[PDB]
Amino acid sequence: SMQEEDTFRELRIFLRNVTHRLAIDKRFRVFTKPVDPDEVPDYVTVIKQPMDLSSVISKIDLHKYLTVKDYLRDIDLICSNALEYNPDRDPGDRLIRHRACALRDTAYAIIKEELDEDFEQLCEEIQESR
Numbered sequence: 001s002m003q004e005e006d007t008f009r010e011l012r013i014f015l016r017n018v019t020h021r022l023a024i025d026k027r028f029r030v031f032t033k034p035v036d037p038d039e040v041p042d043y044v045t046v047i048k049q050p051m052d053l054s055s056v057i058s059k060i061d062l063h064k065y066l067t068v069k070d071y072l073r074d075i076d077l078i079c080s081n082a083l084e085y086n087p088d089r090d091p092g093d094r095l096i097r098h099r100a101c102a103l104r105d106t107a108y109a110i111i112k113e114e115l116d117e118d119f120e121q122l123c124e125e126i127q128e129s130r
């Protein structure tokens with residue numbers, strides 16, 4: 001229905017705003033763009049499902065997210081990719097891991113504070129009906 005299209009629209013507007021707020025945080029700059037093969041030619045080798053905040057915007061705009069749960073799976077991927085690609089005790093890896101945990105924690109905290117649970121539940125029920 002048009003009401004369901006309106007619901008998904010509101011979801012996309014909400015997800016673009018959360019994503020923008022993460023992307024403008026200087027801590028999260030490394031997560032804003034895909035990894036350039038030049039700097040890191042072994043990246044695409046190790047990480048089978050690369051994800052970054054520019055790709056998340058593109059996915060929102062392509063109507064790939066019908067629930068906040070599905071969006072959070074991609075935020076979780078940005079985090080777990082960074083924990084897997086950068087697992088060493090050296091400070092460069094520890095700094096990326098801490099920034100990746102912080103992204104994930106920040107996205108969850110904004111959603112806890114600003115997503116209405118009944119809005120999510122509605123999205124989940126429209127998705128499950130499709």
Ligand SMILES: OCc1cc(Br)ccn1
Nearest residue numbers: 064065066070071073074
């Ligand atoms: O969980 C991430 C995701 C990817 C696609 Br494609 C659609 C929905 N959710």
Ligand SMILES: [Cl-]
Nearest residue numbers: 026027029095
């Ligand atoms: Cl830095």
